[PDB]
From a paper:
Proteins containing a FIC domain catalyze AMPylation and other post-translational modifications (PTMs). The FIC fold comprises eight conserved α-helices and encompasses a characteristic active site loop between helices α4 and α5 that forms most of the catalytic center and the substrate binding pocket.
Although the motif is highly degenerated to PFxxGNE, the fold of the domain and, in particular, of the active loop are canonical. Nevertheless, the binding of a triphosphate-nucleotide appears to be impossible due to the presence of the side-chain in position G2 (compare Figure 9A and Figure 9B). However, simple outward rotation of the glutamate side-chain allows the accommodation of an AMPylated side-chain in a constellation very similar to that of the Tyr-AMP target side-chain in the IbpA/Cdc42 complex. However, binding of an AMPylated target to members of this group of BepFICs appears possible, which suggests that they might act as deAMPylases with the glutamate in G2 involved in binding and deprotonation of the hydrolytic water. B11C_Bep8 FIC crystals were grown from a solution of 30% (v/v) Jeffamine M-600 and 100 mM HEPES free acid/NaOH, pH 7.0. Data for Bqu_BepC FIC with ADP, Bcl_Bep1 FIC, and B11C_Bep8 FIC were collected at 100 K on a Rayonix MX-225 detector at a wavelength of 0.9786 Å on beamline 21-ID-F at the Advanced Photon Source (APS, Argonne, IL, USA).
Numbering used by the authors: 8 to 220
Write the structure that this text describes.
Amino acid sequence: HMARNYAYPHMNTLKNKHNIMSTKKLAHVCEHYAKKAIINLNKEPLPQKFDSSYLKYIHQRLFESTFEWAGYTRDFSFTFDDGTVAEMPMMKVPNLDIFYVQGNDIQENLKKFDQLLASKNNLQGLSREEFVDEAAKLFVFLNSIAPFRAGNEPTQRVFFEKLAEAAGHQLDFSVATEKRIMRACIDGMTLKDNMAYKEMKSLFEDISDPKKI
């Protein structure tokens, strides 16, 4: 019942601070502010701890001009300015018959995500190959959580680009096609144990290659 409260009562478009009713126009305005926020974000030092708090902060910065719930995950019972309360425990993977992590498990998974990074020292002190391997596995995991109502993709990309930088390497998702990145995410959620990570590893190899220039 509460999931419909993220969108307008009379249109499917997501509620937003711009009062924009076209999903197409909203997307554009959204990309605009996200880009502006990245400029200020890039001036800040890299955090000591790479964790869900930092992920939320990125999402907050990317979307605070557009979404009232920016920075809040979809298990958070969010009160809009209009008085309605929104929450989204069930979110399906688009076009496929699988679900992202259920709302009630988001916190435990994000905690596990935080623990892995901390245990592995934010993937520092590794070779580019080792980083690529570990990073790809963590990316697949986080992708399957999809902790936010929307804006998961650009948020997780900024997070991993920052993680790579702090780990002494580089990741530039813009060097690869959207079709390929999606294909890797899908493989990550559909293929058996070993194979799930393969396309993501392959992607990360390419987008971490300085000759990307």
